[PDB]
Design an enzyme around this catalytic site. Structure first.
Site, PDB file in Angstrom:
ATOM      1  CB  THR A  42      -2.541  -1.172  -4.192  1.00 32.38           C
ATOM      2  OG1 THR A  42      -3.434  -1.133  -3.074  1.00 32.38           O
ATOM      3  CG2 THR A  42      -2.109   0.259  -4.523  1.00 32.38           C
ATOM      4  CB  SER A  43      -2.771  -0.671  -9.925  1.00 36.98           C
ATOM      5  OG  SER A  43      -3.001  -2.066  -9.989  1.00 36.98           O
TER       6      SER A  43
END
Ligand SMILES: [Mg+2]
Ligand SMILES: [Mg+2]
Ligand SMILES: [Mg+2]
Ligand SMILES: [Mg+2]
Ligand SMILES: [Mg+2]
Lengths: 125, 226, 204, 195, 212, 196, 222, 222, 196, 195
Positions: I1-2
């Site tokens: 996840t970013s």
């Protein structure tokens, strides 16, 4: 290869002589004179620096050698044989004594160790 | 244990405390932690005391033979290379942590070496349980171009910080000064700030206090003549 | 489980004026079980005395080993080994087993026959030398011995005063240790006479 | 195995050793002789891990018998016990140690004295007036400490031994199926066939 | 530790050693291992010192409440069961207790109950508990008779603790003796093992293995 | 540790921080992580200090013996010797090494040898704990055939950020420039790079 | 039982002739990641007390709210809330020490080391420590974490015992504190250059200094 | 995993005289190889001529002393200001300790005072509340170093009268308060030499019919 | 996840990738990680999907009940409710949440709540596994009071790099813009951001 | 505890239970009665973890005695065994289960039949002609399988029981100090005082 000479090169002749030892002593006889004198408060060892050439720096050739801080050695005969014996004598003073007792060997025992090395070159293959 | 090394103008100095411990118990109150590798190459050891002594004497022995073989005075980089390759081979199982210092024909040198075989260079170093107390003093007062007198002062002050603040360190300060073109001067018990006060009472017993079952002479002499 | 406290026992050594003293308890056990009350832990090779605490099989083995080595030393050197030299031999011998050590706490005591100087030394199981001026302690009641020696000891005690000091140090230390006691021996060592005394103590 | 006892009296050494061999759930034998004659006047009893006990005992027996033939001479009990100790002390730092505890009862013909040596698997040797291995001492030593005298006859030694076995049979949880008793004296080794 | 209690013609003998250890370290040589529950009941200390002290004092309180409510001396059976039921409630929590509850009443006579922290409650004639229990059992079993005199029974209990104190590393210090009668227990003194050993060795001729 | 090597028009430059930690204690704040294995073949070390020093010393020995027999070794050859040691002893080593060198025939070259002992020839390489924080920055800002001054700025800015975020990195930024002109050492202090 | 996530490093402090000094850097670490760079870890309570906190930052923020609530509560039905019945450093500490020990006793500690620095009503210096175990102690100098190992040795050279306190000026004390912060920046891998410093004096009151920096640094020799 | 316990070192010593009692302790507080404080009082006057020390984990030690002091206060409230006798205090402390049998106060407690006949009294407790009246008791780090010395010099163990050779014991003659203090000081001086956790200072509380008096002595600070 | 949130002149913008992984398998390649808790208060979620969804649903409930009684909540209030849930249940949660909102009085605000449940008010915040790789880039490129177009470019470029290096991040870049003008959703596909 | 045996013959049920109580190292008692009378014609023997055995047995005894008084009626052996099973089945999913195995020997006065029930600590009940718990069955069942007849007299049952105990005493490693034997029939419960 492999060292296939596993047999003695010094052997008794019919008369009981060990030829190779006698011949080694003959090589010593041809060698330059060295001497030793013991005094009450010291010992002196001396020899001639027979320089092979005047272009040679005879200070770089040490005939008298320190074995331990309190033991020195001089020779007569074959120089190269002496040099390697000095290397072995210096090392054996550490390996068979100083690394065990934390002190340098007495003269008679270091002599004994050098003698043992020389004896073995008279019997080993 | 607190050990330090400090570079100065014309050489290097090292110092150490004199307490050796077994857990929380003080085994020896005046231990000698400054060891000689060669006349002008000295080192101080922290960690496993037998290992620091043994690895010093082994490399010291081989350094002496090397010196005789080469007809040259021993170098600190030789001691360093031999120590690290020995320690690396044993993968940290020889618990020797050393500060190595000395002078030789190349100049003056100061190195640290850890048990796994890694080495460092520095102008000031500290090792042992009191190294953080010592390094605090070194980081506060070290400067470039220290004199001999200033370096001895800084080194012993750093050991004192360990003595007073680290429970693993105590008793006295030992110092060794290695200056270029001079004999190394070993200063055993350079400082003595921890002498025990006189006791309130003498505990010498009256003779005959202890109950005895048997007495006998022990023959320590060899078998006798006649 | 801990090899240094299976069998139990203690050794203590002290220096005095022109004399040394070395003492030990006599117990050998198997943990809680008392097995022998005649297991002496002090040995001598010429005029050099060696006390050994710890695992009893190693105590016996090391005594036999040092008898072996000091006998060969004497034949070759043509003289009896000195305390300073023997101390180095003990250290060398222990460190050769660095990664499979003898589980022992040796103590050396003696007087140098040439200088007349009293000498004592102690070792960890791996050969590190503790050369104290005052006293050396070893065994399962070493903490207790440190406490006794630190308060009872004073320098330059005469032989017969040193006997009382070292005896009381041993006895009271042993009586605070479950695995020590069952009798005790004290050696008083002078340059050319050694006296051995067995002490009377509680047998629990 | 389990219980092995020893007692040195005036003129002999008596060794008592249990007869049971138990492999976990079942008692496989009730007449096992946990002893080997090392020489005419030296007997060794043993207890420890299965297999290793007999292997060690027979190995020692073979070595002492070899010495006896080579020199035409019987080693003293002290000499035999020292040989055995060294073998166990060597063994404890081996790849797989002998897990064997022994008692050596011998009559020294030179000194005219009985001798009892107790050696555990570590190589821990002690000369004793009476000894044991395992838990046997825990039950019997308080009785031996009370009644033992150095001038006891062989018959008195056997009676004190019976009291020790009776206490073992009362307070020990395991059934060791009685003991085989052997006497070592100036005339050699013999077995008491009713005990 | 070594504690014992045995029934005989004249009542009950209770004998204990005095040593407490923490590992190899001898913490105390002067521990009281007989708990005086009340003037008629005694308990012995083995396992956990606190668990034995605390809960056997508590037992004394319960016994006192019983006799206030019922106007009658509590039986040894009832007293021992109050303790065993209590420790059984705590089973699994880690209490450590091995004790002999000793008493002498009209309806029961001299009675001993072995009570234990895993819930065991055993009535019996001879009990011995602690690290030196096996040594004391040997002396007890070979010398015990119902028709022992009070004097000989007291000595037997003393001698059995001495046997354990000698051989067991974790037993010693001193011996405490008690004699329990129907009219209450009677204390028979503290006996230093060091002094007792030599005294017994000379007078009895025992311990020839030890040089004195 | 924050280390990198970057090829440029005139050759290659190696960069490194100077922080060596034992847990949270900084054992050495002025460490030299740029190590010479040959005249114009250097390397950046990460992982076990003992391991990477041991490896580098052995490589230096190998390349010294190579030079005596066969003349100057290539950067590829040096990387191969590093790889041989790292790959064959992968079970007993924790070493991440970047190899950088200058030939006259091949010019500036960079090889990275990660934990497993694989070899990867790259235009530039980053490694060490601090490198994670500058993957984005370096990828966005790297160009091929930069000038010496640009490459110095690229490495100075990159390691500045690595030092800023990584607690295991810090001290001075050391650099070694490898070109035909020779070998140049550079150093940059905190008061310089922290204000970038 | 938990583990600290976002953490603050050393808090250092000492007594001097007229009061106390306390200092702590402005970093909130996330393991080896130097995540947050503007964290205030010295929290003043009134004008006589400053509480310095290291360790878990989430727990620090909770403690900060407890202290804020304590001030509100003390003012309730209290006409002398800004005079004789104001909060003392000793009251604030004892409350925190109670909370810390209670929390460790429930096996759910506030994962912190705390130093309460202040001046009492009678002018007496107050300096005492408490941590996640509920362990408390006092000393002329106090420090947490790395500060205990590196700052204390330096600060103890100035005030080595109780009798050194009246001989120590505020200038000498602040100088010693600032130098210690520099040494910690050299040697602690979880420290920052930016820090706060608070002086509580019986004459001049509470002086709170923000945005201080470590300066006069040596590197050259490298 | 969170460890609710710690070790603050320290060594304490209680000795009961004929008409007096002393409870002494060193003033050094430590964790691991660091010194927290060179002067942190460990022996406390608890009122009613009773002195107390709970050595080991200092948080548990402080908690126990605090709860006992409180128990003395409430004993006065509930029982018409009756003086709490030393034997009654000892039984009360057992219940305080055993109350946490399954999560113990990690301390070795000693109290000292006078019994109801005016004779010197010392009581000793284990962590879970087993207790006994004793003549002589050392506690904490260097207890194993001190007790054998006290067996020999207070109770004259292994000491016999010269000339009799073991037949007559050295008689147990009563010691004065000056004599006891000498033995306490020498015990702590010797313990300081050989134990790293013992040092800095020695504080002795002396209890007589006249009340509680204090004496302080310097110890080596290394 | 970013994930990230960035304040700018006109308010605040939230950004996120769309990849959800179970080990190395991409369970969902078009996930919506930008979650509404109030009209102009949104959040970015990282950590346990179950935990962060549960927390967000509870917060949305709390702010709905707050609004009915006391009117529109502040962004600080929303962050406080998030923190209360995260801090008090820290033993049983794995949640890293960034809270972003627009007031008219306070304008754009960003709060980050990391694992422990602490709160940190910042000009911008980054989180998730991919954020490690863009600490350097974001620190170098962030400016205060950027325009809408600049902030979109900053987030697009930042998350592009995070996606490039982080295997756990990928898919589309989604964005939510919070201003006085209202709420605008943006989406950017791989063929767009991969060529940046 | 250890060995508990049961055999149902023509007109009675015989229960045999060992006398030893061992606490680890020592045998503390050699006369322990591992049984409780639940009602005049119902006997229960037991073995398992220390403390829990007697606690469980006395708890069951109290409950059956309570029922007997309330209803002025003796429950059938089947009814008692079902009550006991439920208590153990309840116990096995408790915080700390009763680690107790039981045999219930009862004479049903309504049916004029002996009945033997074997129940383990899990609540596993079976009605059997003969039964055991622990390792006892491993040694004895091959003998019982061979010799057992449903029309055996009480005396023949006791003789077959003696053969079982003899085999146990031969092959079992533990000394269980003999057995107490009790007979349950139409006249109630009685103990065989010489066995
Ligand atoms: Mg003892
Ligand atoms: Mg004993
Ligand atoms: Mg110190
Ligand atoms: Mg969850
Ligand atoms: Mg991706």
């Amino acid at each position: 290869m492999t060292d296939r000479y596993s047999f003695s090169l010094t052997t008794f002749s019919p008369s009981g002589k060990l030829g190779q030892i006698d011949y080694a002593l003959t090589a010593v006889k041809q060698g330059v004179t060295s001497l030793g004198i013991k005094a009450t408060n010291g010992v002196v060892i001396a020899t001639e620096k027979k320089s092979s050439s005047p272009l040679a720096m005879s200070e770089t050739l040490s005939k008298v050698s320190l074995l331990t801080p309190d033991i020195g050695a001089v020779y007569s005969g074959m120089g190269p044989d002496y040099r390697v014996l000095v290397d072995k004598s210096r090392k054996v003073a550490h390996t068979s004594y100083k690394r065990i007792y934390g002190e340098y060997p007495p003269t008679k025992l270091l002599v004994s160790e050098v003698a043992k090395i020389m004896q073995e070159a008279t019997q080993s293959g | 244990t607190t050990i330090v090394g400090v570079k100065f103008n014309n050489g290097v100095v090292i110092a150490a405390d004199t307490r050796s411990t077994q857990g929380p118990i003080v085994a020896d109150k005046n231990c000698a932690k400054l060891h000689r590798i060669s006349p002008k190459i000295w080192c101080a050891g922290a960690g496993t005391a037998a290992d620091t002594e043994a690895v010093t004497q082994l490399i010291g022995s081989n350094i002496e033979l090397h010196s005789l073989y080469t007809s040259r005075e021993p170098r600190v980089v030789s001691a360093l290379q031999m120590l690290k390759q020995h320690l690396f081979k044993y993968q940290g199982h020889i618990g020797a942590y050393l500060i190595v210092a000395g002078v030789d024909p190349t100049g003056s040198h100061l190195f640290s070496i850890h048990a796994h075989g890694s080495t460092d260079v520095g102008y000031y170093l500290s090792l042992g349980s009191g190294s953080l107390a010592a390094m605090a003093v070194l980081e506060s007062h070290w400067k470039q171009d220290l004199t001999k007198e200033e370096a001895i002062k800084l080194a012993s002050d750093a050991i004192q910080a360990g003595i007073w603040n680290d429970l693993g360190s105590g008793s006295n300060v030992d110092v060794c000064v290695m200056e270029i073109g001079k004999d190394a001067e070993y200063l055993r018990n350079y400082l003595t700030p921890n002498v025990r006060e006189e006791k309130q009472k003498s505990y010498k017993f009256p003779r005959g206090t202890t109950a005895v079952l048997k007495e006998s002479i022990v023959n320590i002499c060899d078998i006798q003549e006649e | 489980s801990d090899p240094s406290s299976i069998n139990g026992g203690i050794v203590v050594a002290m220096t005095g004026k022109d004399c040394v003293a070395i003492a030990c308890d006599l117990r050998l056990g198997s943990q809680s079980l008392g097995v022998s009350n005649k297991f002496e832990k002090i040995f001598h090779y010429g005029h050099v005395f060696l006390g050994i605490t710890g695992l009893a099989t190693d105590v016996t083995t090391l005594n036999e080993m040092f008898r072996y080595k000091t006998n060969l030393y004497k034949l070759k050197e043509e003289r009896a080994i000195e305390p300073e030299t023997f101390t180095q031999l003990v250290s060398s011998s222990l460190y050769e087993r660095r990664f499979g050590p003898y589980f022992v706490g040796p103590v050396v005591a003696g007087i140098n026959s040439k200088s007349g100087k009293p000498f004592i030394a102690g070792f960890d199981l791996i050969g590190c030398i503790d050369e104290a001026k005052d006293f050396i302690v070893s065994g399962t009641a070493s903490d207790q011995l440190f406490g006794m020696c630190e308060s009872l000891y004073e320098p330059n005690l005469e032989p017969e005063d040193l006997f009382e000091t070292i005896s009381q140090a041993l006895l009271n230390a042993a009586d605070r240790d479950a695995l020590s006691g069952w009798g005790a021996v004290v050696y008083i060592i002078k340059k050319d006479e050694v006296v051995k005394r067995y002490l009377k103590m509680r047998q629990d | 195995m389990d219980i092995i006892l020893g007692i040195r009296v005036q003129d002999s050494v008596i060794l008592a050793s249990s007869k049971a061999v138990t492999r976990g759930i079942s008692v496989l034998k009730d007449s096992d002789d946990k002893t080997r004659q090392l020489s005419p006047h030296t007997l060794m009893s043993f207890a420890g891990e299965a297999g290793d006990t007999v292997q060690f005992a027979e190995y020692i027996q073979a070595n002492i018998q070899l010495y006896s033939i080579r020199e035409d001479y019987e080693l003293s009990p002290q000499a035999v016990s020292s040989f055995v100790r060294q073998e166990l002390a060597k063994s404890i730092r081996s790849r797989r140690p002998y897990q064997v505890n022994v008692l050596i009862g011998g009559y020294d013909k030179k000194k005219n004295k009985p001798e009892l040596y107790q050696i555990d698997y570590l190589g821990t040797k002690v000369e004793l007036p009476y000894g044991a291995h395992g838990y046997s001492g825990f039950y019997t030593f308080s009785l031996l400490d009370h009644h033992y005298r150095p001038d006891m006859t062989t018959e008195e030694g056997l009676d004190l031994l019976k009291l020790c076995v009776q206490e073992l049979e009362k307070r020990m949880p395991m059934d060791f199926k009685g003991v085989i008793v052997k006497i070592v004296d100036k005339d050699g080794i013999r077995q008491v066939d009713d005990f | 530790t070594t504690t014992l209690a045995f029934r005989f013609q004249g009542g009950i003998i209770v004998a204990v050693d005095s040593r407490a250890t923490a590992g190899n370290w001898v913490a105390s040589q002067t521990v009281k291992k007989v708990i005086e529950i009340n003037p008629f009941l005694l308990g012995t200390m083995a396992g956990g010192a606190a668990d034995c002290q605390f809960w056997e004092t508590w037992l004394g309180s319960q016994c006192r409440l019983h006799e206030l409510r019922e106007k009658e001396r509590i039986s040894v059976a009832a007293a021992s069961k109050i303790l065993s039921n209590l420790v059984y409630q705590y089973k699994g929590a880690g209490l450590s207790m091995g004790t002999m509850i000793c008493g002498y009443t009209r309806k029961e006579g001299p009675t001993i109950y072995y009570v234990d922290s895993d819930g065991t409650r055993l009535k019996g004639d001879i009990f011995c508990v602690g690290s030196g229990q096996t040594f004391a059992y040997g002396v007890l079993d070979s010398n015990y008779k119902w028709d022992l005199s009070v004097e000989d029974a007291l000595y037997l209990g003393k001698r059995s603790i001495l046997a354990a104190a000698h051989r067991d590393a974790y037993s010693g210090g001193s011996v405490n003796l008690y004699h329990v009668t129907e009219d209450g227990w009677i204390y028979h003194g503290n006996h230093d093992v060091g002094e007792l050993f030599w005294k017994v060795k000379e007078e009895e001729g025992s311990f020839n293995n030890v040089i004195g | 540790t924050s280390i990198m090597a970057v090829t440029f028009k005139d050759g290659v430059i190696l960069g490194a921080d100077s922080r060596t930690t034992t847990g949270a204690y900084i054992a050495n704040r002025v460490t030299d992580k740029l190590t010479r294995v040959h005249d114009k073949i250097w390397c950046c070390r990460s992982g076990s200090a003992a391991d990477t020093q041991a490896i580098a010393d052995i490589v230096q020995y190998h390349l010294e013996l190579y030079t005596s027999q066969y003349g100057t070794p290539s950067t590829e050859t040096a990387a191969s010797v590093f790889k041989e040691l790292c790959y064959e002893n992968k079970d007993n080593l924790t070493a991440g090494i970047i190899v950088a060198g200058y030939d006259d025939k091949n010019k500036g070259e960079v090889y990275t040898i990660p934990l497993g002992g694989s070899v990867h020839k790259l235009p530039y390489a980053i490694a060490g704990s601090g490198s994670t924080f500058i993957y984005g920055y370096c990828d966005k800002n790297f160009r091929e055939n930069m000038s010496k001054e640009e490459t110095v700025d690229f490495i100075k800015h990159s390691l500045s950020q690595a030092i800023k975020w990584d607690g295991s990195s810090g001290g001075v930024i050391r650099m070694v420039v490898l070109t035909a002109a020779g070998v140049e050492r550079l150093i940059f202090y905190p008061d310089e790079y922290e204000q970038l | 039982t938990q583990q600290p996530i976002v953490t603050g490093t050393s808090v250092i402090s000492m007594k001097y002739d007229n009061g106390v000094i306390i200092a702590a850097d402005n970093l909130g670490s996330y393991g080896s990641l130097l995540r947050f760079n503007g964290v205030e870890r010295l929290i003043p309570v009134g004008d006589n007390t400053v509480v310095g906190i290291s360790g878990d930052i989430s727990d620090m923020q909770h403690i900060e709210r407890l202290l804020k609530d304590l001030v509100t509560e003390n003012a309730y039905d209290n006409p002398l809330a800004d005079a004789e019945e104001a909060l003392e450093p000793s009251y604030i500490f004892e409350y925190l020490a109670t909370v810390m020990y209670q929390r460790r006793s429930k096996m759910n500690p506030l994962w912190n080391a705390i130093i309460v620095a202040g001046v009492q009503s009678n002018g007496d210096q107050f300096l005492r420590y408490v941590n996640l175990l509920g362990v408390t102690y006092s000393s002329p100098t106090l420090a947490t974490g790395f500060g205990a190992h590196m700052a204390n040795p330096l600060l103890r050279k100035v005030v080595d015992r109780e009798s050194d306190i009246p001989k120590t000026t505020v200038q000498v004390a602040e100088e010693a504190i600032v130098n210690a912060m520099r040494v910690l920046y050299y040697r602690d891998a979880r420290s920052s250059r930016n820090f706060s410093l608070a002086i509580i004096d019986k004459n001049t009151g509470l002086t709170f200094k923000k945005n201080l920096q470590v300066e006069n640094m040596k590197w050259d020799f490298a | 995993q969170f460890n609710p316990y710690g070790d603050n070192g320290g060594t304490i010593l209680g000795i009961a005289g004929e008409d007096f009692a002393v409870l002494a302790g060193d003033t050094r507080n430590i964790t691991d190889y660091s010194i927290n404080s060179r002067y942190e009082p460990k022996v406390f006057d608890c009122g009613d001529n009773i002195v107390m020390s709970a050595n080991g984990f200092a948080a548990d030690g402080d908690a126990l002393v605090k709860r006992f002091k409180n128990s003395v206060k409430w004993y006065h409230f509930d029982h018409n200001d009756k003086k709490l006798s030393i034997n009654s205090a000892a039984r009360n402390i057992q219940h305080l300790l055993y109350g946490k049998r399954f999560f113990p106060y990690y301390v070795h407690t000693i109290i000292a005072g006078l019994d109801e006949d005016g004779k010197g009294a010392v009581y000793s407790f284990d962590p879970v509340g087993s207790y006994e009246r004793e003549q002589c008791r050392a506690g904490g780090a260097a207890a194993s170093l001190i007790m054998p010395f006290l067996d020999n010099q207070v109770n004259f163990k292994n000491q016999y009268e010269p000339g009799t050779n073991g037949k007559v014991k050295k008689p147990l003659k009563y010691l004065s308060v000056e004599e006891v203090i000498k033995l306490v000081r020498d015990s702590f001086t010797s313990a300081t030499e050989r134990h790293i956790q013992v040092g800095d200072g020695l504080e002795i509380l002396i209890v007589t019919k006249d009340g509680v008096r204090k004496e302080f002595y310097e110890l080596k600070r290394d």
